[PDB]
RNA sequence: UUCCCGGGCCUUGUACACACCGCCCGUCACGCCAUGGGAGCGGGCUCUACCCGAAGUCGCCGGGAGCCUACGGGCAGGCG
């Protein structure tokens, strides 16, 4: 027995070091790349378009426009190749997956996605709190 | 003395004048050139309508928040 508990044992690859976010709010993920036997940390930053929750190997995809072409990247949420991920802004999604933005991509999405104050306000307030409460 | 040939004088018509064995016209054939049309093909300029929209000035907001304050202000920022 413990069919899932065994496969759930299987991960020493879970990682707690990355931030909370949901679809709709924009983030920036730094990712190890090769680029000809050298090594670089490339950043990729756009709206997170969706999140697939499987526990370990959940994955989340990020969309942005780059030099006049939309791009989506799909990252494994536990990937050993993610150095860090910063949330660069929060936004109010209204539904789980937003693919609908692909056929907007214009000003109409900054109207559809207006920033989520509740989670913004609780970020600052969480950052003031942890800042004040570490030192003294 | 009508007719054929040549000739003389006057006259008349002429686009002939190396002068009627003159001049000249239009198709057709050939060569060269330029040009119209032509299923279309390419390009330039332009107009109309609608979508998206940089930088920017302008206008409204500056609030569940920021910063400075000379705080019933200004700034970042947001929207048009
Ligand atoms: Mg079990
Ligand atoms: Mg005569
Ligand atoms: Mg003759
Ligand atoms: Mg002659
Ligand atoms: Mg022609
Ligand atoms: Mg517009």
């Amino acid at each position: 027995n413990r069919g899932a508990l065994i496969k759930l044992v299987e991960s020493r690859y879970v990682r707690t070091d990355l931030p909370e976010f949901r679809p709709g709010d924009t983030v920036r993920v730094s990712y190890k790349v090769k680029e000809g036997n050298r090594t670089r940390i490339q950043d990729f930053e756009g709206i997170v378009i969706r999140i697939r929750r499987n526990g370990f190997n959940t994955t989340f995809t990020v969309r942005k426009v780059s030099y006049g072409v939309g791009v989506e990247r799909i990252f494994p949420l536990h990937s050993p190749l993610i150095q860090k991920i910063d949330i660069v802004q929060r936004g109010r999604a209204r539904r789980a997956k937003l693919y609908f933005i692909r056929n907007l991509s214009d000003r109409e999405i900054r109207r559809k996605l207006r920033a989520d104050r509740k989670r913004i306000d609780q970020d600052r307030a969480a950052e003031r709190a942890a800042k004040e409460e570490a030192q003294k």
Side-chain angles (χ1 to χ4, degrees):
Chain A
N1 249 359
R2 73 182 293 195
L5 189 54
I6 285 190
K7 78 182 175 194
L8 250 193
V9 133
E10 223 40 62
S11 328
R12 357 156 164 275
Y13 320 102
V14 314
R15 56 193 273 172
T16 137
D17 51 321
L18 332 122
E20 46 140 34
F21 56 110
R22 1 229 254 186
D25 57 23
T26 142
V27 320
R28 161 171 60 246
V29 23
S30 316
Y31 204 91
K32 255 128 275 222
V33 295
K34 269 63 184 180
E35 306 276 27
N37 295 112
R38 206 241 307 195
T39 273
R40 171 169 75 111
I41 11 74
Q42 166 174 20
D43 275 308
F44 180 90
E45 161 197 356
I47 318 222
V48 6
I49 262 46
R50 78 156 179 181
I51 282 161
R52 303 186 33 243
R53 281 165 209 298
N54 210 4
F56 182 45
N57 67 26
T58 75
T59 51
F60 66 108
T61 100
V62 189
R63 165 163 224 265
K64 75 167 181 207
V65 190
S66 167
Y67 292 89
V69 190
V71 189
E72 304 189 343
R73 267 231 99 188
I74 296 150
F75 302 109
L77 186 274
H78 297 261
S79 186
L81 275 95
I82 297 185
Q83 162 190 306
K84 69 168 172 55
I85 151 181
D86 327 319
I87 87 107
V88 337
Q89 156 72 292
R90 300 284 190 201
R92 175 176 170 60
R94 218 66 185 91
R95 53 176 32 81
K97 327 233 135 313
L98 356 80
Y99 312 104
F100 74 93
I101 62 183
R102 286 154 175 168
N103 328 324
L104 290 32
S105 223
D106 41 342
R107 115 170 54 167
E108 297 255 351
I109 121 171
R110 18 277 183 195
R111 143 176 170 245
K112 246 38 192 62
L113 272 202
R114 270 188 207 101
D116 174 24
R117 293 253 74 110
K118 175 161 175 294
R119 291 191 304 129
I120 281 181
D121 288 354
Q122 74 191 32
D123 265 11
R124 285 189 273 91
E127 142 201 32
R128 279 285 190 183
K131 173 198 182 187
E132 288 168 346
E133 292 193 329
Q135 33 185 1
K136 252 59 187 178

